Symmetry: D2
Subunit: 294 residues, 4 copies
Amino acid sequence: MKNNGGARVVVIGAGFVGASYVFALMNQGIADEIVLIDANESKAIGDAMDFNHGKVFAPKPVDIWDYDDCRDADLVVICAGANDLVDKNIAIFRSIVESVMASGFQGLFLVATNPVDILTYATWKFSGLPHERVIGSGTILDTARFRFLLGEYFSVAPQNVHAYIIGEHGDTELPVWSQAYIGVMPIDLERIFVNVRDAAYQIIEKKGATYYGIAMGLARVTRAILHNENAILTVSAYLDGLYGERDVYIGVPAVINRNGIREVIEIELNDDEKNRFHHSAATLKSVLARAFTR
Amino acid sequence: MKNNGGARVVVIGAGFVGASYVFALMNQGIADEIVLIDANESKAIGDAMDFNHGKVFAPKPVDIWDYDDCRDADLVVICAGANDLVDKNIAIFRSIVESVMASGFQGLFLVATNPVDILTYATWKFSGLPHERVIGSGTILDTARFRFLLGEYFSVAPQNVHAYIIGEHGDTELPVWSQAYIGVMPIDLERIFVNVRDAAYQIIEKKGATYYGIAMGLARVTRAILHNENAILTVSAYLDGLYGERDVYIGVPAVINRNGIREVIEIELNDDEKNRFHHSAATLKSVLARAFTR
Amino acid sequence: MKNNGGARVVVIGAGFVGASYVFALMNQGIADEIVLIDANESKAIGDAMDFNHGKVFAPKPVDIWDYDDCRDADLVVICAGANDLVDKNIAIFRSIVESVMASGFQGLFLVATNPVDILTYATWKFSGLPHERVIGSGTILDTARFRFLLGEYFSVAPQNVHAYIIGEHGDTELPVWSQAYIGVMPIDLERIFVNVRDAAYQIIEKKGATYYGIAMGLARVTRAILHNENAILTVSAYLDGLYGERDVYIGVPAVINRNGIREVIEIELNDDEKNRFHHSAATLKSVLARAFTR
Amino acid sequence: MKNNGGARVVVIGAGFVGASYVFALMNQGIADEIVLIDANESKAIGDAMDFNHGKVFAPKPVDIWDYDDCRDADLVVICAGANDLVDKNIAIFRSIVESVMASGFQGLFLVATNPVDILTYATWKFSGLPHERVIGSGTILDTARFRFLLGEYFSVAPQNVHAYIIGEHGDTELPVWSQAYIGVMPIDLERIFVNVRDAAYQIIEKKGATYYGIAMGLARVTRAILHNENAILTVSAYLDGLYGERDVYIGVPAVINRNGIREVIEIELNDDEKNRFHHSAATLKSVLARAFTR
């Protein structure tokens, strides 16, 4: 035919997260075509060159530096945005989505930009799409941070720790202590969790910003989608009347696979319920009413 | 025993090249332990945290944020340095090497810092080590850029283009046109080469700096070492009386493998000899006499 | 939707080659879905179970144990056949192809069964398909054997040797000595080649049969297809009036990519032309006239 | 120096398990050097050739076809043995171990041969070695089979199922139902387990023998060792007075890493204790007294 595609990823925002995300995919031999769009086109051109010159060296993808690219674009990762956030960001977002949609996109959205559970809801409101097709970065890196520290405590391998962080990607997130195992053996640790939650601030203070952490987390959900994993990942899924909530996007165990979210799991919560999670859901449910507008 | 090592890499200079190098190794599942040393310790601590939180997500290495680490440190990649270069840099370098050596290092040096063919010679002069154990980044990315553009021209895959850029990592490098094949079939293309040589300036102008390109190139030589490849890579090797030259480090086809360089190959040169290459060798042979001192 | 596909491979003949091919793909994390069809269904069921129980352990594909599977089946690898060959085999083949076609297959054929250059032509004659969509295993393993032995001679890495074996996958194949390089440096070696050609007989005599060799070779062309490589691989391509020949399938450098063969390259041949290659082409061109029928 | 090693694996018994194990490692780019020893030397020569010809095609290991090879041989996988088993096998084993030891081996033993928990104990008795350095294949494939079937039931990904099979690799193994989770959510399923335990017999009946299953399982523990994972794998570890038992090797959660077993975990057992596990331990504890001798 012409020269095909099949698994294309369009990253809106070639900046630290965008860039480190691409480099992840690239070095992981995850996508076929990888298109980069930034409103500072000189920067996307520049990274696209940089990616292409050592490509020879990895295991094979094609890279390219508008939105007429979100054609048969499988997945769109939206890493753009400001740094009064919420309604600046919803404003920026109001344009990114309107335009990917214009080329009649069929795909999936993966939103990495803080305040994410909020921008993830907005992405859904602005595109049309069933809410199983609009995913949010969520507490994915939070539960990675978590699983790394506990993994270090027991000196086992983080991939044998099974412990979640759910709620809002931020201050209100709570850990799910009652169903945290190491292998199949249930379990200071309240300290560990305080280091999991002030972790951003902590890395930001000594190097100005976070970006490898997440990209890696952004590279896994991509894995789950592009490969139909049916992975249980803790993302920013839309609540259904599942933890008790009816119209919010929050961080929760969801099953991932090629066609977006399959199903949100309800882990059974302590009385760490309509308390930490309700509290959390509530904090957000209201930024959505307080926020929006322009 | 205690908790082992086996394949450790110490990157001196956790900055764009250092950082993107580490992230490469990490996402490629290339080294076991990866130690990061920077004189701005707050920055190495910060990247070390960042690398560790999404580690869970890759295929398994350990990361750690002085020089008492270059112990049974397999390979030391020296990505540090200024931005009057040569003798600032030789000055900075004069301290990095003195100190990795103090912990009685046995390993290999891989020097990525411009002006590299020069700093690579200095690294050799400052450590002691046989010159087969001190490697330089060389024209490795140059011949990647080359092979990418020609690969695009013929629309084949850069990994089927076989064409080298040798000489100095800079203005004087020349391409080896007479022994450039596509598969086994020999071959504007003088244009392509002018874009290969003004490529840095070109990416630097639109994004401020180069770094993914090289790291990828830095990740391959590491591959060659750590895995005993016996790869023919165009690095910054020390000339022997091989292309006609007697005491310089320049960019040339060398065979790579666990114990440093095996042997420098003499490709047979057109009268693109004691002309482009001699010229090149000469340009450098003299910065080494002009330079040095403090 | 339902549960997707995207990159499906159907191996007809779950036997040594089939089985070791699947296990290759599996351990390489090359295809999504991998369907296995054998006329001894108890054997495909049995390997399918075997593959599924340790799957957990690799990086993620799905496996399944008729032809209603060659639906949106991307690639069909035909590893089946006897052990008076040609017209037994063309007979077996006459049924495999008729039936994959019945489910209205759109895909690509990759034929591994000796006498292959012949069965590859037959596959093309029996399906309908443009000849760029019917590929043959060819001298792919031959030039691997070649590149391994020379690679061992120079003690370099086979992946730096660039040397082809073209002609018929069998007695008449000749090596292309005049355009064989090591890096970009041209070159007993007539011995090496006699060991490349009596290699099957040699491994067959001490372990009864060959199978890992090829599968690995069968796993690469699959790579080239599924990933759009644009790889220069020496397969069994149909000659056009390219080496001088007009209606034969023989082993020759072709460029590979998602939509089948792109283009056959004419390396420039010594007077190792309308002599070894003509001879070779002729040997086959005539088994096709001698053979066929039932 | 000469030409190095670092991570060498010696497989005693190049047969289905041995062969498929090697091909696993090879296609996974797991070990550096891989040496194959079989008392039917014509068969190891033959597979070694077969592995070497398509090597070019994988990501780089070296292969070689006695015991003077268990020199600085990191790991020895013992896949040999009969098909009155126990004391035929202990007899065969009595020679393999005596001879790897003769070249003063320092390494680790990984025993794949049924009846394994028994031959694993014998390997320990015949070599000298601390029991943390002699590992057994154990219920590793059993809990893979388990996790695959449950993973299929919930339609999630086996790698999110966390459920163990412990006890003897055979009839007496029991599943640990009380601490089996899917993500962190605890749970016919007694059917699933009856299919996990009659699975060998089931695949053996339709294809004559099992081999891919295990190799894959044999490739993971190798991963754990060679890379210092600190993985929680259910192997054949020696009991200490841990589940209640004092001198037996049985299938149990152990933590794996470069220097052999770290520590056996005691998951907390239902009254699925000094009942299924005690029963199991007892069945074996006595074959060791009944067995042995010549």
